[PDB]
Amino acid sequence: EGLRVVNLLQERNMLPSTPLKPPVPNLHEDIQKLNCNPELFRCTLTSIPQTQALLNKAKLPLGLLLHPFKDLVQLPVVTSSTIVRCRSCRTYINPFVSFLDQRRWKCNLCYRVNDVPEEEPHRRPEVQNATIEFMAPSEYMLRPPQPPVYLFVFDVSHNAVETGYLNSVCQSLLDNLDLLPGNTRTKIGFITFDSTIHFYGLQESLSQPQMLIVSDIEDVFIPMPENLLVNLNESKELVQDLLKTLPQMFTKTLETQSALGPALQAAFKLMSPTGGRMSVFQTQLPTLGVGALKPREEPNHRSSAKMTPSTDFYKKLALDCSGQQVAVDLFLLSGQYSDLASLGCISRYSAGSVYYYPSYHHQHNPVQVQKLQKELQRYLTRKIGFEAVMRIRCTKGLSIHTFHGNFFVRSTDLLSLPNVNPDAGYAVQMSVEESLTDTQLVSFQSALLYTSSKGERRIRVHTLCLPVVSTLNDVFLGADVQAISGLLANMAVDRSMTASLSDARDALVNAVIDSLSAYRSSVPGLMVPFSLRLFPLFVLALLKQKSFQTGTNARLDERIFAMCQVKNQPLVYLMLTTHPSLYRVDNLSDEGALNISDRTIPQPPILQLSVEKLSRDGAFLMDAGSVLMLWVGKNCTQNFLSQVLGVQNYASIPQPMTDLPELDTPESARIIAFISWLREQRPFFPILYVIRDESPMKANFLQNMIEDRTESALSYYEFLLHIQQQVNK
Amino acid sequence: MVLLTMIARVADGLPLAASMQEDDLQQYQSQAKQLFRKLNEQSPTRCTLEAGAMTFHYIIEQGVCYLVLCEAAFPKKLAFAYLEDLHSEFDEQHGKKVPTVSRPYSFIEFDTFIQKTKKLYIDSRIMVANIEEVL
Amino acid sequence: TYLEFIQQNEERDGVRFSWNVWPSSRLEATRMVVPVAALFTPLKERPDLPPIQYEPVLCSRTTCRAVLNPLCQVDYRAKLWACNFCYQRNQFPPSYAGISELNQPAELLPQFSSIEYVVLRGPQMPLIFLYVVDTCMEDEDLQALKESMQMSLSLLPPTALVGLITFGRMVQVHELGCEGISKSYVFRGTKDLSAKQLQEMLGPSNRFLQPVQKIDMNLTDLLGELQRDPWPVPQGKRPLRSSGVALSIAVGLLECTFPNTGARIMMFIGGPATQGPGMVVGDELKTPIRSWHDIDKDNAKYVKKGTKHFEALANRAATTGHVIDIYACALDQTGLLEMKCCPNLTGGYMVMGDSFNTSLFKQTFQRVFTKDMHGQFKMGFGGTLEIKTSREIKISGAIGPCVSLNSKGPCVSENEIGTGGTCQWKICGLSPTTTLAIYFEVVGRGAIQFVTQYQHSSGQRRIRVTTIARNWADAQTQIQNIAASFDQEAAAILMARLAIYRAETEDVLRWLDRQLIRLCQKFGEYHKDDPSSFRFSETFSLYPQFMFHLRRSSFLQVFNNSPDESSYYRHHFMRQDLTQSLIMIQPILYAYSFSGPPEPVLLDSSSILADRILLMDTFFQILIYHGETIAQWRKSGYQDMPEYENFRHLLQAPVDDAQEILHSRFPMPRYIDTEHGGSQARFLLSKVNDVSLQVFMDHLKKLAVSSA
Ligand SMILES: [Zn+2]
Ligand SMILES: [Zn+2]
């Protein structure tokens, strides 16, 4: 712990050796033990400023970050024949209410006193768990629970055919056909497209599937009333045969044009009646029909900071899907510019997500192949919620003014989520609309109303309680550096689309300068409170990330995708991507968690992102959340080469090395135990590639050394020198 | 001569199973829930309501109401035959569990039978009252 | 004999003129009561004439170019032949260098007037067959239809190309042998497509038209798996059938793939088109399809716009040289009135029935593919008919299955009849029975040469040449020689063609009567004002009777028939040869009884005896009537008794004679077995008998002997 002050210019080794842990709100013991898990719901300032004036002085953003549908280990499910909610603001009775007349409770959000219905009340599950799931009564559904509906839309043009993506996708579907969430009501369908739209009829009475082709690009329609979206259970065999045939039907195709816009409209018409999840696979710029996009010249390290959609077609389309409870996930596997800035809209506004696989090729890109494989695996098997809405409530006085994430905001701030997935993150920015002079505690409550894959209307609720403070020092003491960095990244993405990349990068640097400056004016070197000792480091990382970097050679869609991730991912993965964990791994030992019964699990210390920490004498593992790169030094030990890599010398380490082998050596067991532990901390199996040699021309391992200097960016030290110059200007 | 089918427990009007397809539902779906709410042990066990261009048809068996909406033109004779097919199947399958459940649509899966029975009627190849009244 | 002359000339040249001796003066030519006209059958079959694998040999006078024929004056010494049409003298082509007197070219022997040449120089185009199938019909009808189609596929030539288009609410153009899937292109039946549009939306042989030998197995299976239009049909509604758009897409497909080459667009429909373009009736069952009565009282809002849509398709097809067939079977009307031009303008067929699941349709359908003594279809494609006449003869026009090539010249008359203003016609589809009516005008021995170029079912391009000559009337016996050359049967049909053509393109009876009376006054015999004195020679005596039956026929008196039946009757009448035509107008009737063998008897109520069996051959129906008495003896059962093996020969004599003709005839006639009291007897009763022929005759005589 500590209320100490740090001089950033003298420490320079402030990153801790062990994982960073979220701040613990300064709350009474009993209240804090009931608080919401920080992985599910957290605040950028665990000590909420009592006034907007106080908030503005600190120069730190106030907001919430949430991962509401996260996969839980244990979840309390209350089936109450009646759901207890405040008669005024409809808030769900929670652990932080105030029981007085033991038959009357005071709402922690609007202060109204309610009557506890005749149905030790403070012992009820609803008051003992901050996270809980309720069964929704008949009044919480606009229609009978919709069945699960999966519609797959595939690009099959010449380029798409050349990538070979269809084969793996169809193969992943076949293997997971029985794992797709749902009961006997599950429906599935397929559409392929090039210059035309191809539907597939499936009937047990016919000898084979029928390809119904709509060529009228300017006026799509559903060719058949039945058998396009078929019942999976009943037609399992017919779907399996199709998945086995598709990858072979377009081998010799000559179609170079892709009518994505019309195909999406037809897919929409097909799903409009029920709603569901549309999975679109595209490999190039759409150029035929409505929604066609113009080519663009990729930038270069030279071009300065001089983002937005070229058209609103996909946004309007995404809004239409949303009103019909249709979510659109986009899998872009393009080798050339495909205007993702415009295509991405289809997923942003319908609550879907975008998956990107730059230069995907069945033979040429063994890395993107396995990535898609593992990402599809998660995608097809993770839990899902249908036709959902989310509402975020906070105590009177606090107001949410900006929402971040993939959804569509309706009236009186209703978050429309056609689909709700367990890997999506959201963020909110708030302000103190009314001085909190009254209370000493404030609450935050998110309610997620959805239909399960089993057809049951459910409501998942998370409640967070935090203390209110009135001094500048208390605001700083409770600051959550990671949460603040996450909300700033989201704010910067909006600023980029709103003003420009330059304006975004500037506001990022000014949030650091403004905050330390405010700090300084209320206390020689660069002084910062303990809670913010990592603030400049994380912002610098953000500035060097693919979303905001400048002098680099990053391509257009790459930047957009990184921004899509900032907006759609949960805090934890944003941090892993922005500031990867680096560990030395050629000399692992026993200071680990050899507690896991029969496994030891080494716990090497986290190193800061600098080439000054590397060494040509060892090997280093970098955990970037989505991937794990293992760099091997040229002068690495012979023991590591033979006992871990299974090679006799550096020279013979296979170029693309998709993973480590499992050799019968104690050294192999250690590293493989370490890596196994890293990937067990998440649901998206992260691929590993040692390909990171000292000459594989894939040493993009270095781009993550955010602390060193580059020809077009400052080092960590320079950045600090710059901030100090501004702090005491 | 189209669709909208709802099966619910008479006592509380708890929904048990239903089927709908558009490509409004909103208005008539409320009226259906209005009926269910009104229905009780004294209600006619076989009735037909008139709602303008539309006409409701229902039957009550073992405390379970089988309602259906359609264009007034649709053959009244077929609507009831349709209801009878659903009843026998539903009562046979879940007839004994109905009085115990408590969650809405606890038999959503009955969704399938409904639609495979619905098509055998929407393809050519008792008492009357203005619903507006009962409500 | 004038009869032998008429017979032998129709046999050798497939032709029959109203007059076999023509007017040598302007004062007579203009006063011709019945026009000089001919009933021409370009492909009539005969005693195996040797096909001439030549270079037909044409005249060398740019404008003329007639074909070397028997009327040409030759000179085997000077190796020259003088044309008989323009007197242009020609040199014999090299390949004829060695022709001699005791061994001359076949086209010169009077026996080979009317001869066929084969022109072999360029690779032959394969035949094309596009099936266009309605799926809006009962299962038994569809299954039966699927079977008939599969059967026809087993008869097509290995090289023929076939394509399939199915429809109901949507139109599907199938891509055959697409492997492991079976795909088609679906279009809304709600809006029409040009051909350029279609060509773009879709993309020798195409993906849609493949050789039978490569695709036959895949198509048989596809045809066998065809099912009902998937769209439900709500109560009191007709299914939505896009016949108009299905046909426009079929026409468009061939137009942009194989224009100007023989092709057959075969459309099978099981109900009226209920979703225009081409719409014939709405989808509400409560509203009946139009009747003639409904049409006359302007209560048929779809007829005209629907007729316009198909007439445009007809001309598009006929212009591209493609044939359109319509096979229509349903319990109710199908819209043949609105679609008639497609099969009428192109030489396509029109088959009508109650259901595809009957012997009638199945047999009529397989007749379509009857083959000759070489295993080849009896059909010809893309026929171009050009007629050349003496400078003294001009052509008013033609009436029958054809379209005008609108080619001008000195043979063209100002007075056009039917499709006129040309000396060249296109007949996209024709057979050995196809018959055209050509009306001429005079402005010895006059000559006319008919040249028919067409694509044979084998693929060979052929040229049929028939040159005929008739004497010019001798000046000192004009009307006398002219009258003796009258062909009352041929003239009755030619006049009927004109009358029916005027009715189907609107009183026609008045015109018919004025001409009947005029013929009576010019060639009859009588004392003015004495009806009883009127008589006609053996050459004109049957004309009045044929006229009586024609004006009372269902060809002119449409009410009492559905508009579709009327269009069907006329369609067949406008293509048929003389023999069959006469039967249509005046049904032949045969009597059967113990008292003597079968005999022909008058079409009168007086021939309906109780102890006799009658057989009536309407071209459209073969009916057997059992008189009251024989009806009883038959209801009694005497037939089975070994005692009455005679009553059997009788009861089956008519059934035997029926079978024979009930097979040769293309549209298989409907067969009916009725008797006195039966309800089906009505058919015989309405054909039998102003009023009766006797009363009709008296009036004609009262007007013949009076004022001109
Ligand atoms: Zn409240
Ligand atoms: Zn000449």
Side-chain angles (χ1 to χ4, degrees), chain C residues 183-214:
Chain C
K183 66 190 201 180
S184 50
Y185 284 69
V186 191
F187 299 81
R188 276 178 157 148
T190 258
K191 58 181 188 176
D192 212 314
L193 297 170
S194 61
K196 186 176 176 181
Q197 298 173 288
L198 197 60
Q199 169 192 288
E200 302 177 298
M201 290 177 275
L202 295 177
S205 56
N206 300 301
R207 320 204 305 284
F208 308 91
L209 304 170
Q210 294 194 64
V212 176
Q213 67 177 297
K214 293 184 179 180

Short mmCIF file of all heavy atoms in Angstrom, two decimals, chain C residues 183-214:
data_model
loop_
_atom_site.label_atom_id
_atom_site.label_comp_id
_atom_site.label_asym_id
_atom_site.label_seq_id
_atom_site.Cartn_x
_atom_site.Cartn_y
_atom_site.Cartn_z
N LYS C 183 -28.62 -26.07 -59.33
CA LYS C 183 -28.99 -24.69 -59.14
C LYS C 183 -29.79 -24.11 -60.29
O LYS C 183 -29.72 -24.58 -61.43
CB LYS C 183 -27.73 -23.86 -58.93
CG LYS C 183 -26.82 -23.78 -60.13
CD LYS C 183 -25.49 -23.15 -59.75
CE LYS C 183 -24.77 -22.58 -60.95
NZ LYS C 183 -23.48 -21.97 -60.55
N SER C 184 -30.55 -23.08 -59.97
CA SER C 184 -31.36 -22.37 -60.93
C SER C 184 -31.33 -20.88 -60.58
O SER C 184 -30.85 -20.49 -59.51
CB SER C 184 -32.80 -22.90 -60.90
OG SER C 184 -33.32 -22.96 -59.58
N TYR C 185 -31.80 -20.04 -61.50
CA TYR C 185 -31.86 -18.61 -61.28
C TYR C 185 -33.32 -18.27 -61.09
O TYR C 185 -34.15 -18.55 -61.96
CB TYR C 185 -31.28 -17.84 -62.47
CG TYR C 185 -29.77 -17.87 -62.52
CD1 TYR C 185 -29.09 -19.05 -62.82
CD2 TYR C 185 -29.03 -16.73 -62.24
CE1 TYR C 185 -27.69 -19.09 -62.83
CE2 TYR C 185 -27.64 -16.75 -62.25
CZ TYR C 185 -26.98 -17.93 -62.55
OH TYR C 185 -25.60 -17.94 -62.59
N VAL C 186 -33.64 -17.69 -59.94
CA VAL C 186 -35.02 -17.34 -59.61
C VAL C 186 -35.31 -15.87 -59.90
O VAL C 186 -34.51 -14.99 -59.58
CB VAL C 186 -35.31 -17.63 -58.12
CG1 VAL C 186 -36.82 -17.51 -57.84
CG2 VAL C 186 -34.79 -19.02 -57.75
N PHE C 187 -36.46 -15.61 -60.51
CA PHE C 187 -36.87 -14.26 -60.85
C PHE C 187 -38.29 -14.04 -60.37
O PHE C 187 -39.06 -15.00 -60.24
CB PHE C 187 -36.83 -14.02 -62.36
CG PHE C 187 -35.46 -14.19 -62.97
CD1 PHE C 187 -34.98 -15.46 -63.28
CD2 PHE C 187 -34.66 -13.09 -63.24
CE1 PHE C 187 -33.71 -15.63 -63.86
CE2 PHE C 187 -33.40 -13.24 -63.81
CZ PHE C 187 -32.92 -14.52 -64.13
N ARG C 188 -38.63 -12.79 -60.08
CA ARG C 188 -39.98 -12.49 -59.66
C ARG C 188 -40.85 -12.67 -60.90
O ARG C 188 -40.44 -12.34 -62.02
CB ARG C 188 -40.07 -11.05 -59.14
CG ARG C 188 -39.66 -10.92 -57.68
CD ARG C 188 -39.69 -9.48 -57.16
NE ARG C 188 -39.84 -9.49 -55.70
CZ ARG C 188 -39.33 -8.58 -54.88
NH1 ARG C 188 -38.62 -7.57 -55.36
NH2 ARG C 188 -39.51 -8.70 -53.57
N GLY C 189 -42.05 -13.23 -60.72
CA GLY C 189 -42.93 -13.41 -61.86
C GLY C 189 -43.74 -12.15 -62.02
O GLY C 189 -44.63 -12.06 -62.87
N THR C 190 -43.40 -11.16 -61.20
CA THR C 190 -44.07 -9.87 -61.13
C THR C 190 -43.66 -8.83 -62.15
O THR C 190 -44.42 -7.91 -62.46
CB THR C 190 -43.90 -9.29 -59.71
OG1 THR C 190 -45.12 -9.49 -58.98
CG2 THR C 190 -43.54 -7.81 -59.76
N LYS C 191 -42.45 -8.95 -62.69
CA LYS C 191 -41.99 -7.97 -63.65
C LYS C 191 -41.25 -8.62 -64.81
O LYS C 191 -40.52 -9.59 -64.64
CB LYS C 191 -41.10 -6.94 -62.96
CG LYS C 191 -39.90 -7.53 -62.26
CD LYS C 191 -39.09 -6.44 -61.58
CE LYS C 191 -37.78 -6.99 -61.04
NZ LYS C 191 -36.92 -5.92 -60.47
N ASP C 192 -41.45 -8.05 -66.00
CA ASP C 192 -40.85 -8.55 -67.22
C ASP C 192 -39.38 -8.16 -67.38
O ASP C 192 -38.90 -7.21 -66.77
CB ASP C 192 -41.64 -8.03 -68.42
CG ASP C 192 -41.64 -9.00 -69.58
OD1 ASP C 192 -40.56 -9.54 -69.92
OD2 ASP C 192 -42.72 -9.22 -70.16
N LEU C 193 -38.69 -8.91 -68.24
CA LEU C 193 -37.28 -8.69 -68.54
C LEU C 193 -37.09 -8.67 -70.06
O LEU C 193 -37.73 -9.44 -70.78
CB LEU C 193 -36.44 -9.80 -67.91
CG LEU C 193 -36.49 -9.87 -66.38
CD1 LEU C 193 -35.83 -11.14 -65.89
CD2 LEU C 193 -35.80 -8.64 -65.80
N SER C 194 -36.21 -7.79 -70.53
CA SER C 194 -35.95 -7.64 -71.95
C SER C 194 -35.31 -8.83 -72.66
O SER C 194 -35.97 -9.55 -73.39
CB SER C 194 -35.08 -6.40 -72.19
OG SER C 194 -33.84 -6.52 -71.52
N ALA C 195 -34.01 -9.02 -72.44
CA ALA C 195 -33.24 -10.10 -73.08
C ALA C 195 -31.80 -9.67 -72.90
O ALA C 195 -30.89 -10.48 -72.75
CB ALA C 195 -33.57 -10.20 -74.57
N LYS C 196 -31.62 -8.35 -72.94
CA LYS C 196 -30.32 -7.75 -72.73
C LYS C 196 -30.19 -7.86 -71.22
O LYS C 196 -29.18 -8.33 -70.70
CB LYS C 196 -30.34 -6.29 -73.18
CG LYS C 196 -28.97 -5.60 -73.13
CD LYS C 196 -29.04 -4.17 -73.69
CE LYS C 196 -27.71 -3.44 -73.56
NZ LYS C 196 -27.78 -2.05 -74.10
N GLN C 197 -31.24 -7.46 -70.51
CA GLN C 197 -31.24 -7.54 -69.05
C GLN C 197 -30.96 -8.98 -68.62
O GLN C 197 -30.05 -9.24 -67.84
CB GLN C 197 -32.59 -7.11 -68.50
CG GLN C 197 -32.97 -5.67 -68.81
CD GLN C 197 -34.39 -5.34 -68.39
OE1 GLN C 197 -35.35 -5.80 -69.00
NE2 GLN C 197 -34.52 -4.56 -67.33
N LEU C 198 -31.75 -9.90 -69.16
CA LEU C 198 -31.63 -11.32 -68.87
C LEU C 198 -30.22 -11.79 -69.17
O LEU C 198 -29.58 -12.45 -68.35
CB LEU C 198 -32.65 -12.10 -69.71
CG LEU C 198 -33.02 -13.54 -69.32
CD1 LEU C 198 -33.61 -13.55 -67.93
CD2 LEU C 198 -34.02 -14.11 -70.31
N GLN C 199 -29.72 -11.43 -70.35
CA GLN C 199 -28.37 -11.81 -70.75
C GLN C 199 -27.33 -11.36 -69.71
O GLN C 199 -26.37 -12.08 -69.42
CB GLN C 199 -28.04 -11.20 -72.10
CG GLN C 199 -26.58 -11.31 -72.48
CD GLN C 199 -26.24 -10.44 -73.67
OE1 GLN C 199 -26.62 -10.74 -74.80
NE2 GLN C 199 -25.53 -9.34 -73.41
N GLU C 200 -27.52 -10.16 -69.15
CA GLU C 200 -26.60 -9.63 -68.15
C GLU C 200 -26.74 -10.34 -66.80
O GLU C 200 -25.75 -10.79 -66.22
CB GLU C 200 -26.84 -8.12 -67.98
CG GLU C 200 -26.66 -7.33 -69.27
CD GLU C 200 -26.97 -5.85 -69.12
OE1 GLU C 200 -28.13 -5.50 -68.80
OE2 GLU C 200 -26.06 -5.02 -69.32
N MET C 201 -27.97 -10.47 -66.32
CA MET C 201 -28.23 -11.13 -65.04
C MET C 201 -27.74 -12.57 -65.00
O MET C 201 -27.26 -13.03 -63.96
CB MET C 201 -29.73 -11.09 -64.72
CG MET C 201 -30.22 -9.70 -64.37
SD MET C 201 -31.99 -9.64 -64.07
CE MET C 201 -32.55 -9.46 -65.69
N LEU C 202 -27.86 -13.27 -66.13
CA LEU C 202 -27.44 -14.67 -66.24
C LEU C 202 -25.97 -14.91 -66.63
O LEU C 202 -25.41 -15.96 -66.30
CB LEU C 202 -28.32 -15.41 -67.26
CG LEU C 202 -29.80 -15.60 -66.96
CD1 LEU C 202 -30.44 -16.28 -68.15
CD2 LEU C 202 -30.00 -16.43 -65.71
N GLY C 203 -25.35 -13.96 -67.33
CA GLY C 203 -23.97 -14.15 -67.75
C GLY C 203 -23.72 -13.77 -69.21
O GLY C 203 -23.85 -14.57 -70.14
N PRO C 204 -21.74 -25.84 -80.09
CA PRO C 204 -22.09 -24.79 -79.14
C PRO C 204 -23.11 -25.23 -78.09
O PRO C 204 -23.82 -26.23 -78.28
CB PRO C 204 -22.64 -23.68 -80.05
CG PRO C 204 -23.29 -24.45 -81.14
CD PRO C 204 -22.27 -25.54 -81.43
N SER C 205 -23.18 -24.50 -76.99
CA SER C 205 -24.10 -24.79 -75.89
C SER C 205 -23.79 -23.87 -74.72
O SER C 205 -22.66 -23.43 -74.56
CB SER C 205 -23.97 -26.25 -75.45
OG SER C 205 -22.63 -26.55 -75.08
N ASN C 206 -24.80 -23.58 -73.90
CA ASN C 206 -24.63 -22.71 -72.74
C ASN C 206 -24.65 -23.53 -71.47
O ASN C 206 -24.52 -24.75 -71.50
CB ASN C 206 -25.76 -21.69 -72.65
CG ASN C 206 -25.84 -20.80 -73.86
OD1 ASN C 206 -24.88 -20.10 -74.19
ND2 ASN C 206 -26.98 -20.83 -74.54
N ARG C 207 -24.81 -22.85 -70.34
CA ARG C 207 -24.89 -23.53 -69.07
C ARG C 207 -26.35 -23.93 -68.92
O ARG C 207 -26.68 -24.88 -68.22
CB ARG C 207 -24.51 -22.58 -67.92
CG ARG C 207 -23.33 -21.67 -68.24
CD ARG C 207 -22.64 -21.21 -66.97
NE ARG C 207 -23.56 -20.57 -66.03
CZ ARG C 207 -24.04 -19.34 -66.16
NH1 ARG C 207 -23.70 -18.59 -67.20
NH2 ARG C 207 -24.86 -18.87 -65.24
N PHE C 208 -27.22 -23.21 -69.63
CA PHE C 208 -28.67 -23.44 -69.59
C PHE C 208 -29.21 -24.32 -70.73
O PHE C 208 -30.36 -24.75 -70.69
CB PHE C 208 -29.39 -22.09 -69.60
CG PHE C 208 -28.90 -21.15 -68.54
CD1 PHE C 208 -27.88 -20.25 -68.81
CD2 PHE C 208 -29.38 -21.26 -67.24
CE1 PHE C 208 -27.32 -19.48 -67.79
CE2 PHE C 208 -28.83 -20.49 -66.21
CZ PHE C 208 -27.80 -19.60 -66.48
N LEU C 209 -28.38 -24.57 -71.75
CA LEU C 209 -28.80 -25.37 -72.90
C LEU C 209 -27.68 -26.34 -73.28
O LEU C 209 -26.75 -25.96 -74.00
CB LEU C 209 -29.11 -24.45 -74.09
CG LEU C 209 -30.16 -23.35 -73.86
CD1 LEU C 209 -30.15 -22.41 -75.04
CD2 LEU C 209 -31.54 -23.96 -73.68
N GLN C 210 -27.77 -27.57 -72.80
CA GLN C 210 -26.74 -28.56 -73.08
C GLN C 210 -27.18 -29.74 -73.94
O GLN C 210 -28.36 -30.09 -73.98
CB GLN C 210 -26.19 -29.11 -71.77
CG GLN C 210 -25.43 -28.09 -70.95
CD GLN C 210 -24.64 -28.75 -69.86
OE1 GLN C 210 -23.73 -29.53 -70.12
NE2 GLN C 210 -25.00 -28.45 -68.62
N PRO C 211 -26.22 -30.38 -74.64
CA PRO C 211 -26.48 -31.53 -75.51
C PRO C 211 -27.19 -32.62 -74.74
O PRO C 211 -26.84 -32.91 -73.60
CB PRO C 211 -25.07 -31.96 -75.93
CG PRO C 211 -24.28 -30.69 -75.85
CD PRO C 211 -24.78 -30.08 -74.57
N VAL C 212 -28.19 -33.23 -75.36
CA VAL C 212 -28.94 -34.29 -74.70
C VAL C 212 -28.03 -35.42 -74.21
O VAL C 212 -28.11 -35.84 -73.06
CB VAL C 212 -30.01 -34.85 -75.66
CG1 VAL C 212 -30.72 -36.02 -75.02
CG2 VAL C 212 -31.00 -33.75 -76.02
N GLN C 213 -27.13 -35.90 -75.08
CA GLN C 213 -26.24 -36.99 -74.72
C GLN C 213 -25.37 -36.77 -73.49
O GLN C 213 -24.94 -37.72 -72.83
CB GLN C 213 -25.33 -37.34 -75.91
CG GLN C 213 -24.33 -36.25 -76.27
CD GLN C 213 -23.42 -36.66 -77.40
OE1 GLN C 213 -22.65 -37.63 -77.29
NE2 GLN C 213 -23.49 -35.94 -78.51
N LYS C 214 -25.09 -35.52 -73.16
CA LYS C 214 -24.27 -35.26 -71.99
C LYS C 214 -25.12 -34.97 -70.75
O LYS C 214 -24.76 -35.36 -69.65
CB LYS C 214 -23.33 -34.07 -72.25
CG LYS C 214 -22.27 -34.37 -73.32
CD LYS C 214 -21.28 -33.23 -73.49
CE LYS C 214 -20.23 -33.57 -74.55
NZ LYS C 214 -19.24 -32.47 -74.75
#
